[PDB]
Amino acid sequence: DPDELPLDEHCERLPYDASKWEFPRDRLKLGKPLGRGAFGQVIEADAFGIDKTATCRTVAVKMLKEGATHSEHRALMSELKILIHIGHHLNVVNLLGACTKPGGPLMVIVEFCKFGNLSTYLRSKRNEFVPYYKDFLTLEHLICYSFQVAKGMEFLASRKCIHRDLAARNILLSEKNVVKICDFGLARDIYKDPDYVRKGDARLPLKWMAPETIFDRVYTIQSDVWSFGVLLWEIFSLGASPYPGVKIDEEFCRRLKEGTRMRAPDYTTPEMYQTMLDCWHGEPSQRPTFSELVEHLGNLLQANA
Ligand SMILES: CNC(=O)c1cc(Oc2ccc(NC(=O)Nc3ccc(Cl)c(C(F)(F)F)c3)cc2)ccn1
């Protein structure tokens, strides 16, 4: 049903309103790289007056790199188009502008998120965590981050988009404990990153993928719910790697379809662990929706206080 169909499958027909989004290249001061893949990269920049008149703003710019071809260039343009269609939400990395004019590289300019990816950040805070000390993480923070990602994903779903690589490495942490969903995409070196496992010609985030995705190449909002459950485990393990000590092979995939699930992580509550189990239902339609996750996590956040 084309009304169920994720926008992004048909990105090429979406509009690029240059009068709204185009940002002069001479108003962008490029700085240090923030991430590089084989074909893409993100670099830090200072943008003069991109979102507020005459004010310097630190931003992140996604662009291509040596190795990329015309097809990566097309892909980045369609990424720009989907970000415009999606629009602004607190809990999604916000598009600020683009440089698309001939003579320079295509640049997709988004907000800079001070503390980087959530996995790395949580893993740095094992010694600065208490369940209930300024700058210490607490159980409240962790539940709050969970709630925030569910809000951003509910928003993504409302825009008829799905994620396909939802994981703590694709959550950014800003000031004031705001987390933002992103997708590094081409700016991540998936061939060097052990989170992506060779499967055919592709390198795939198998530990985050729902059984229907692994076996039938089916991507839906409900397979995103499965990944959200894995993200929850990452949050409540303070950034540990999923399925610890487990070879990700055909027998891993088999046991998963059979019903094997991860054990509770070190910092979880019982109801957070049950929520992970819910997200990991074998049948996609029996998983909670993001709207249901929002309501439930909102209740947990309230109960925690
Ligand atoms: C220390 N701080 C940093 O290193 C840092 C690095 C950044 O790098 C990035 C720059 C741009 C992006 N681009 C997206 O995210 N593109 C995207 C595409 C589809 C869809 Cl669907 C989505 C969505 F909606 F899921 F969000 C997002 C990702 C990361 C940003 C901020 N800070």
Short mmCIF file of C-alpha atoms and ligand atoms in Angstrom, two decimals:
data_model
loop_
_atom_site.label_atom_id
_atom_site.label_comp_id
_atom_site.label_asym_id
_atom_site.label_seq_id
_atom_site.Cartn_x
_atom_site.Cartn_y
_atom_site.Cartn_z
CA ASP A 1 0.00 0.00 0.00
CA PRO A 2 1.78 3.20 -1.21
CA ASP A 3 0.27 5.08 1.77
CA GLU A 4 2.19 2.71 4.09
CA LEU A 5 5.31 3.07 1.91
CA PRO A 6 8.21 4.86 3.56
CA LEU A 7 9.09 8.20 1.97
CA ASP A 8 12.74 7.70 1.05
CA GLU A 9 11.86 4.82 -1.26
CA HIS A 10 10.72 7.60 -3.63
CA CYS A 11 12.96 10.58 -2.58
CA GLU A 12 13.89 11.55 -6.13
CA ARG A 13 10.50 13.25 -6.63
CA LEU A 14 10.65 15.39 -3.46
CA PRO A 15 11.28 19.20 -3.76
CA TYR A 16 14.48 21.17 -3.05
CA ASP A 17 13.45 24.76 -2.29
CA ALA A 18 16.73 26.66 -2.71
CA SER A 19 15.10 29.99 -1.77
CA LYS A 20 14.50 28.45 1.68
CA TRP A 21 17.47 26.11 2.25
CA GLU A 22 20.43 27.33 0.18
CA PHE A 23 23.26 28.73 2.32
CA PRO A 24 26.20 30.72 0.82
CA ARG A 25 29.44 28.71 0.83
CA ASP A 26 31.40 31.83 1.80
CA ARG A 27 29.43 32.04 5.10
CA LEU A 28 30.67 28.58 6.16
CA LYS A 29 34.08 28.18 7.85
CA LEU A 30 35.10 24.52 7.63
CA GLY A 31 36.96 23.00 10.59
CA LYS A 32 37.97 19.59 11.92
CA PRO A 33 36.45 16.26 10.71
CA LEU A 34 33.90 14.68 13.07
CA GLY A 35 33.55 11.35 11.25
CA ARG A 36 34.71 9.76 8.00
CA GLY A 37 33.58 6.73 6.03
CA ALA A 38 34.85 5.44 2.69
CA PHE A 39 32.75 7.86 0.60
CA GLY A 40 31.34 10.37 3.05
CA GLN A 41 32.34 12.54 5.94
CA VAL A 42 31.05 14.98 8.52
CA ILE A 43 33.05 18.02 9.42
CA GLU A 44 32.65 20.74 12.01
CA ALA A 45 32.05 24.28 10.78
CA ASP A 46 31.17 27.79 11.90
CA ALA A 47 28.19 29.08 9.99
CA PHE A 48 27.55 32.77 10.02
CA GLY A 49 23.86 33.61 10.38
CA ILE A 50 22.45 30.23 9.31
CA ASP A 51 19.53 30.12 11.83
CA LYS A 52 19.72 33.52 13.62
CA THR A 53 20.60 36.89 11.98
CA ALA A 54 24.33 37.70 12.23
CA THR A 55 25.10 34.94 14.74
CA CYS A 56 27.92 32.43 14.49
CA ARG A 57 26.78 28.85 15.03
CA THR A 58 28.87 25.72 15.29
CA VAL A 59 27.36 23.20 12.84
CA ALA A 60 28.03 19.76 11.38
CA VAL A 61 28.30 19.37 7.64
CA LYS A 62 27.77 16.10 5.83
CA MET A 63 29.52 15.90 2.48
CA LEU A 64 31.35 13.43 0.28
CA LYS A 65 35.01 12.55 0.15
CA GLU A 66 37.66 10.92 -2.13
CA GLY A 67 36.20 7.62 -3.39
CA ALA A 68 32.63 8.87 -3.82
CA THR A 69 31.08 8.88 -7.31
CA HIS A 70 28.01 10.48 -8.96
CA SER A 71 25.76 7.87 -7.25
CA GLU A 72 26.84 8.91 -3.72
CA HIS A 73 26.23 12.52 -4.86
CA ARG A 74 22.68 11.59 -5.94
CA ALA A 75 22.22 9.75 -2.60
CA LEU A 76 23.26 12.80 -0.56
CA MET A 77 20.85 15.01 -2.48
CA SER A 78 18.02 12.60 -1.78
CA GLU A 79 19.10 12.59 1.90
CA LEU A 80 18.80 16.40 1.88
CA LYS A 81 15.29 16.10 0.33
CA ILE A 82 14.10 13.60 2.98
CA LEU A 83 15.42 15.80 5.83
CA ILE A 84 13.46 18.75 4.39
CA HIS A 85 10.29 16.60 4.13
CA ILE A 86 10.71 15.29 7.69
CA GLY A 87 11.02 18.81 9.21
CA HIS A 88 12.00 19.91 12.72
CA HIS A 89 11.68 17.97 15.94
CA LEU A 90 13.60 18.38 19.20
CA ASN A 91 14.66 14.75 19.05
CA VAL A 92 15.82 14.52 15.42
CA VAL A 93 19.03 16.14 14.18
CA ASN A 94 17.75 19.38 12.58
CA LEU A 95 18.61 20.42 9.05
CA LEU A 96 19.85 24.02 9.01
CA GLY A 97 20.73 24.49 5.34
CA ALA A 98 22.58 23.22 2.27
CA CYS A 99 25.17 24.18 -0.31
CA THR A 100 24.09 22.66 -3.63
CA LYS A 101 25.29 25.29 -6.16
CA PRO A 102 27.67 24.07 -8.91
CA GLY A 103 31.39 24.71 -8.32
CA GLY A 104 31.65 23.14 -4.86
CA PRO A 105 30.64 19.90 -3.11
CA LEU A 106 27.07 19.17 -2.04
CA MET A 107 26.95 20.01 1.70
CA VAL A 108 24.14 19.09 4.08
CA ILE A 109 24.30 21.33 7.16
CA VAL A 110 22.78 20.14 10.43
CA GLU A 111 23.00 21.10 14.08
CA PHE A 112 26.18 20.32 16.01
CA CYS A 113 25.60 18.06 19.02
CA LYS A 114 28.24 18.83 21.63
CA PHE A 115 28.69 15.39 23.21
CA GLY A 116 28.69 13.21 20.06
CA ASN A 117 27.21 9.73 19.78
CA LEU A 118 25.38 8.28 22.77
CA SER A 119 27.17 4.90 22.87
CA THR A 120 30.63 6.42 23.31
CA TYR A 121 29.29 8.97 25.77
CA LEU A 122 27.52 6.43 28.04
CA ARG A 123 30.60 4.18 28.00
CA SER A 124 32.64 7.16 29.27
CA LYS A 125 30.29 7.57 32.27
CA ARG A 126 30.50 4.14 33.99
CA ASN A 127 32.44 5.83 36.84
CA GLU A 128 29.99 8.79 36.93
CA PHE A 129 26.65 7.04 37.38
CA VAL A 130 24.31 6.67 40.35
CA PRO A 131 20.81 5.14 40.14
CA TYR A 132 19.24 8.01 42.14
CA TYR A 133 27.16 13.73 41.95
CA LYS A 134 26.67 16.75 39.68
CA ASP A 135 27.43 15.78 36.07
CA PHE A 136 26.72 12.19 37.17
CA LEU A 137 24.26 10.20 35.06
CA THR A 138 21.28 8.71 36.85
CA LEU A 139 18.45 6.29 36.12
CA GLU A 140 16.27 9.36 35.42
CA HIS A 141 18.65 10.47 32.61
CA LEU A 142 18.62 7.00 31.04
CA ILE A 143 14.82 6.73 31.06
CA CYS A 144 14.61 10.31 29.85
CA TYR A 145 16.92 9.52 26.89
CA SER A 146 14.81 6.45 26.09
CA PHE A 147 11.61 8.53 26.16
CA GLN A 148 13.23 11.18 23.94
CA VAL A 149 14.30 8.65 21.26
CA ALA A 150 10.78 7.16 21.26
CA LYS A 151 9.39 10.69 20.74
CA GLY A 152 11.77 11.31 17.80
CA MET A 153 10.90 7.90 16.27
CA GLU A 154 7.15 8.52 16.71
CA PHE A 155 7.74 11.79 14.85
CA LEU A 156 9.73 10.03 12.10
CA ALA A 157 6.82 7.54 11.71
CA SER A 158 4.31 10.44 11.57
CA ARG A 159 6.33 11.73 8.57
CA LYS A 160 5.99 8.29 6.90
CA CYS A 161 9.70 7.68 7.26
CA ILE A 162 11.57 4.81 8.84
CA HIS A 163 15.17 4.73 10.10
CA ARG A 164 16.79 1.36 9.17
CA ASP A 165 19.95 1.83 11.30
CA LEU A 166 18.60 2.73 14.73
CA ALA A 167 21.32 2.24 17.38
CA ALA A 168 23.14 4.21 20.11
CA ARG A 169 25.94 5.09 17.61
CA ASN A 170 23.21 6.95 15.65
CA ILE A 171 21.93 8.94 18.66
CA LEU A 172 23.62 12.27 19.37
CA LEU A 173 23.75 14.00 22.73
CA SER A 174 23.42 17.76 22.92
CA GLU A 175 23.47 20.29 25.77
CA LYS A 176 20.78 20.05 28.45
CA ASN A 177 20.43 16.26 28.08
CA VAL A 178 18.69 16.47 24.68
CA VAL A 179 19.27 13.45 22.46
CA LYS A 180 18.78 13.48 18.71
CA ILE A 181 18.24 10.68 16.23
CA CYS A 182 20.60 10.83 13.27
CA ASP A 183 22.07 8.63 10.59
CA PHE A 184 25.80 8.97 9.89
CA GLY A 185 25.33 6.79 6.76
CA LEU A 186 28.18 7.29 4.29
CA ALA A 187 30.14 9.24 6.95
CA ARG A 188 30.66 6.01 8.92
CA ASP A 189 33.35 3.53 7.88
CA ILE A 190 31.13 0.44 7.98
CA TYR A 191 33.94 -1.79 6.71
CA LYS A 192 36.16 -0.94 9.70
CA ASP A 193 33.29 -0.75 12.22
CA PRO A 194 32.69 -4.17 13.86
CA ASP A 195 28.94 -3.29 14.33
CA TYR A 196 28.44 -3.96 10.60
CA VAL A 197 28.86 -7.58 9.57
CA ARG A 198 29.48 -8.90 6.05
CA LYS A 199 26.33 -10.52 4.66
CA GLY A 200 26.49 -11.10 0.91
CA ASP A 201 27.84 -7.92 -0.65
CA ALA A 202 26.42 -5.72 2.12
CA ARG A 203 27.77 -4.84 5.57
CA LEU A 204 24.85 -4.85 7.96
CA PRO A 205 24.11 -3.98 11.62
CA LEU A 206 22.96 -7.56 12.37
CA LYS A 207 22.84 -7.21 16.17
CA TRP A 208 20.21 -4.45 15.82
CA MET A 209 18.14 -6.06 13.06
CA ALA A 210 14.73 -7.74 13.45
CA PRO A 211 14.39 -11.38 12.29
CA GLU A 212 12.12 -10.35 9.35
CA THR A 213 14.81 -7.88 8.24
CA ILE A 214 17.63 -10.43 8.50
CA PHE A 215 15.71 -13.25 6.76
CA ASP A 216 13.29 -11.47 4.42
CA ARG A 217 14.96 -8.05 3.86
CA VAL A 218 11.78 -6.44 5.23
CA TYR A 219 12.25 -2.94 6.68
CA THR A 220 9.24 -1.35 8.47
CA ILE A 221 8.53 0.98 11.39
CA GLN A 222 8.03 -2.24 13.38
CA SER A 223 11.55 -3.53 12.61
CA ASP A 224 12.72 -0.10 13.86
CA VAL A 225 10.88 -1.01 17.11
CA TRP A 226 13.03 -4.14 17.37
CA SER A 227 16.19 -1.97 16.97
CA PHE A 228 14.79 0.46 19.53
CA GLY A 229 14.71 -2.47 21.97
CA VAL A 230 18.41 -3.07 21.27
CA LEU A 231 19.05 0.68 21.76
CA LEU A 232 17.31 0.38 25.14
CA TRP A 233 19.70 -2.42 26.07
CA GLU A 234 22.64 -0.22 24.99
CA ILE A 235 21.33 2.68 27.11
CA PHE A 236 20.80 0.51 30.21
CA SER A 237 24.16 -1.23 29.84
CA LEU A 238 25.71 2.25 29.64
CA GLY A 239 26.99 1.75 26.11
CA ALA A 240 27.99 -1.93 26.10
CA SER A 241 28.03 -3.91 22.83
CA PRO A 242 24.93 -6.13 22.30
CA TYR A 243 25.08 -9.97 22.52
CA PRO A 244 28.36 -9.89 24.50
CA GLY A 245 30.86 -12.64 23.58
CA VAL A 246 28.61 -13.97 20.81
CA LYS A 247 29.81 -14.74 17.29
CA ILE A 248 27.40 -13.11 14.86
CA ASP A 249 26.86 -15.96 12.40
CA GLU A 250 24.11 -18.14 10.87
CA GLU A 251 23.53 -19.86 14.21
CA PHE A 252 23.12 -16.46 15.90
CA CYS A 253 20.44 -15.65 13.33
CA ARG A 254 18.78 -19.06 13.83
CA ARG A 255 18.63 -18.85 17.65
CA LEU A 256 17.17 -15.34 17.34
CA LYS A 257 14.34 -16.56 15.07
CA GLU A 258 13.89 -19.40 17.59
CA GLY A 259 13.26 -16.90 20.41
CA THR A 260 16.59 -16.32 22.18
CA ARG A 261 16.88 -12.84 23.70
CA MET A 262 19.57 -10.89 25.54
CA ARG A 263 19.69 -10.99 29.36
CA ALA A 264 18.92 -7.84 31.40
CA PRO A 265 21.72 -5.25 31.33
CA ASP A 266 23.38 -4.00 34.56
CA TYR A 267 21.49 -0.69 35.03
CA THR A 268 17.96 -1.63 33.93
CA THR A 269 14.76 -1.57 35.94
CA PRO A 270 12.42 -4.60 35.66
CA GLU A 271 9.87 -2.70 33.60
CA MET A 272 12.57 -1.34 31.25
CA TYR A 273 13.76 -4.94 30.65
CA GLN A 274 10.19 -6.10 29.96
CA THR A 275 9.88 -3.20 27.49
CA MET A 276 12.99 -4.50 25.66
CA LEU A 277 11.38 -7.97 25.56
CA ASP A 278 8.15 -6.41 24.16
CA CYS A 279 10.13 -4.65 21.36
CA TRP A 280 11.75 -8.02 20.62
CA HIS A 281 8.48 -9.85 19.87
CA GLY A 282 8.92 -12.36 16.99
CA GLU A 283 5.79 -11.02 15.30
CA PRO A 284 6.21 -7.38 14.12
CA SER A 285 2.50 -6.60 14.65
CA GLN A 286 2.68 -7.68 18.32
CA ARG A 287 5.50 -5.21 19.08
CA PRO A 288 4.44 -1.93 20.69
CA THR A 289 4.15 1.08 18.38
CA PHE A 290 6.33 4.13 18.97
CA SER A 291 3.19 5.97 20.18
CA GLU A 292 2.66 3.22 22.75
CA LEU A 293 6.35 3.37 23.70
CA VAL A 294 6.06 7.15 24.21
CA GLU A 295 3.05 6.73 26.56
CA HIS A 296 4.70 3.88 28.50
CA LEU A 297 8.12 5.50 28.83
CA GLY A 298 6.43 8.75 29.85
CA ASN A 299 4.70 6.79 32.66
CA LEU A 300 7.99 5.15 33.69
CA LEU A 301 9.72 8.54 33.76
CA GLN A 302 6.96 9.89 35.98
CA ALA A 303 7.03 6.79 38.25
CA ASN A 304 10.79 7.21 38.64
CA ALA A 305 10.26 10.71 40.12
C1 LIG B 1 30.60 15.99 18.52
N1 LIG B 1 29.45 16.11 17.63
C2 LIG B 1 29.43 15.48 16.40
O1 LIG B 1 30.38 14.80 15.99
C3 LIG B 1 28.23 15.64 15.52
C4 LIG B 1 28.23 14.97 14.31
C5 LIG B 1 27.12 15.11 13.47
O2 LIG B 1 27.26 14.37 12.31
C6 LIG B 1 26.18 14.12 11.51
C7 LIG B 1 25.85 15.04 10.51
C8 LIG B 1 24.76 14.79 9.68
C9 LIG B 1 24.02 13.62 9.84
N2 LIG B 1 22.93 13.41 8.97
C10 LIG B 1 21.78 12.73 9.33
O3 LIG B 1 21.52 12.40 10.47
N3 LIG B 1 20.97 12.44 8.23
C11 LIG B 1 19.74 11.76 8.33
C12 LIG B 1 19.29 11.08 7.19
C13 LIG B 1 18.07 10.39 7.23
C14 LIG B 1 17.31 10.40 8.41
CL1 LIG B 1 15.81 9.54 8.42
C15 LIG B 1 17.75 11.07 9.57
C16 LIG B 1 16.97 11.08 10.86
F1 LIG B 1 15.71 11.59 10.73
F2 LIG B 1 16.85 9.84 11.37
F3 LIG B 1 17.55 11.80 11.85
C17 LIG B 1 18.97 11.75 9.50
C18 LIG B 1 24.38 12.70 10.85
C19 LIG B 1 25.46 12.94 11.69
C20 LIG B 1 26.03 15.92 13.84
C21 LIG B 1 26.13 16.57 15.07
N4 LIG B 1 27.20 16.45 15.90
#
